[PDB]
């Protein structure tokens, strides 16, 4: 009954979710009523540094994207979108051990889950690009 990184994952992303609907709330709060007994220990831990993570990183993860971006803005993304692009940067540079594959079609099944086949190709465009400029020298190999 180890937690998957899937499922880890996944709780990371709900909490940005709501906290689109929920900005006077502090992130890590909003994870914490998604983590319950379901979760292992690891998965708790992880999705936790995730949290702080982008929530440290905030500015300079979205920035980033941005720098991608032209038809459509940060902003006018869907909820969705915009978030699977936060988590799957925020990813992509500061936890190393994940090749960029996984960070990629992890990011992808997450945006066709909650939008469409067209979220997906779109998601998979920005990341794509975002990760053959910034993937960190670790995950060359």
Known sequence: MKTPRRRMRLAVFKALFQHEFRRDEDLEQILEEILDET???????????????????????????????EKWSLNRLSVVDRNVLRLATYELLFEK?????????????????????????????????????????????
């Open 39 to 69: 979760y292992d220990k690891k998965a708790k831990e992880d999705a936790r540094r995730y949290i702080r993570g982008i929530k440290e990183n905030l500015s300079m993860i979205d920035d980033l994207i941005s720098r991608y971006l």
């Open 97 to 141: 051990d994940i090749p960029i594959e996984v960070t990629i079609d992890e990011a992808i099944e997450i945006a066709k889950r909650y939008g469409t086949e067209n979220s997906g190709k779109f998601v998979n465009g920005i990341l794509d690009r975002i990760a053959k400029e910034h993937a960190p020298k670790e995950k060359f190999e």
